[PDB]
């Protein structure tokens, strides 16, 4: 009788830590202390920095750079770091 020995050849695909690009991080400093006045809102302090991710209109969804939290924050209560003067 004949004979045969099995043995497949597993494979896979995936790229490593390919170079990065396309940055984006709107940093805004709280112009005034905020403790989530209304629902759906993040709480911060006057001088706290947040990473604005989404900016629908006024309130933007930034992540507190203190607790790495995530929630909507008032723009009228923040000021882009690159929007500071003297």
């Amino acid at each position: 009788g004949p004979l045969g020995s099995p043995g497949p050849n597993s494979h896979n695909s995936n790229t490593p830590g390919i170079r990065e690009a396309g940055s984006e991080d709107i940093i805004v400093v709280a112009l005034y202390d905020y403790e989530a006045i209304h629902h759906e809102d993040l709480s911060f302090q006057k001088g706290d920095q947040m990473v604005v991710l989404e900016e629908s209109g006024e309130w933007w969804k930034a992540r507190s750079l203190a607790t790495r939290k995530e929630g909507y924050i008032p723009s009228n209560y923040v000021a882009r770091v690159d929007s500071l003067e003297t």
Binding site: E40, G57, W59, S75, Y77
Partner: peptide, 12 residues
């Protein structure tokens, strides 16, 4: 999210 006409600006 634009739901409220921004919060009431404080003093300092």
């Amino acid at each position: 999210h634009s739901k409220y006409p921004l919060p009431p600006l404080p003093s300092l």
